[PDB]
Symmetry: C6
Subunit: 86 residues, 6 copies
């Protein structure tokens, strides 16, 4: 159960910049991006807890510089059931 | 038409992050099954769980509190005995 | 058959409206429609009396958990309107 | 080139009620309904000018009673090119 | 990359009614071809026309005024010599 | 290659941004993405210098006809980011 990191922005540009800054900051896997309507876009990463925390911190700061940051969160040990909605 | 003669728990958020956190907290809090998530546009996302009523109430209480900390909570509800017809819109 | 509809902002209000409608009267839940902006409509069909009882119960239930936008009953819809509705 | 009548609402309920009131008020053809996002829904009718004006007036009043009316308009003699976006 | 070595007119509205009225007024005002309409979500709708620059300017001016009377006008623009690459997003 | 992006509220601002970008420099217009809520992004690829010139021109052009939301250049995108981008 690898850690899960997520950044949500209003607008795609902030999310693409967040994804690039996340993989630049640490060895994390980019799971993908999700569009939920209303302009909201989420990018998600997986990896060891330390790497996910470093990646999400870098991604949140990068997204805030170019777009609108909405949320930033890390789940260090997600439950296996959560994989069914990722 | 009732199933017998399981309870449904739901949390709706504005944004996916609050829903992923709600889903994780729900399955962590009690013996419930995560049924899935629905996007209805306008940024609204709903995550649904099934199980015995006591487990669904404990899971939704934990999921509502968790979603509010990281995102925007919109609704939280438990239907103890949902009609089978409601499955057609889940 | 009469047509009953409840529109909410958010899916949770619509799931609760649909459950309260089928619980209150013998109506057929046709389904749900998403029109964007968070708006969701649930539609039922049945005899006029059943549809009125179901929609009244559904509207009150939806308002408790979410945001009720509209509630309406068309007792005898024109056949042309069926061409723009969802069907079972 | 039959007249074109249109009613736009915020929400589907107002548009279904508008469509029923339009066909109830006059001999018009319901072309269909369109969802453009943001909750906006448009219902369109065709027929002779007099019938379309009566139908759209009835549909606007009916939609306003149950939902949110946004726009109401009649084009008495639409250009043939407009059929390509209907 | 230019087409030669036609002009594009566009009107964006919030709601379909303003766009249908803009399209009708545009083709009525001048010799332009209605290319189509695009929905981008959030209620925004764009209608596009092609023709000689003078015709496109006359058509967009008429369409902008007509859309504002019945709905919500958001944008109005003419590109006299659009690059062929822009066709990939029209 | 460098990646340039311009996000607007409305399609008109994005069509004008795309035209001004290809007019200003030799960049490849990858396409456009709609993420809901009226937000539209247009993306270009090319050498860093060309992408910076194109995005600067596109941002100024989009602001004149519509609502500019974001403008950004990533000079050397990580290979992983290509998996979430549109491609030609």
């Amino acid at each position: 159960s690898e850690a899960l990191g997520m950044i949500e922005t209003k607008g795609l540009v902030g999310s693409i910049e967040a994804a690039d800054a996340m993989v630049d900051a640490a060895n994390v896997t980019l799971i993908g991006k999700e569009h939920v309507g209303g302009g909201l876009v989420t990018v998600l990463v997986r990896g060891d807890v330390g790497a996910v925390k470093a990646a999400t911190d870098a991604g949140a700061a990068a997204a805030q510089r170019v777009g609108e940051l909405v949320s930033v969160h890390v789940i260090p040990r997600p439950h296996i059931e959560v994989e069914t909605i990722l």
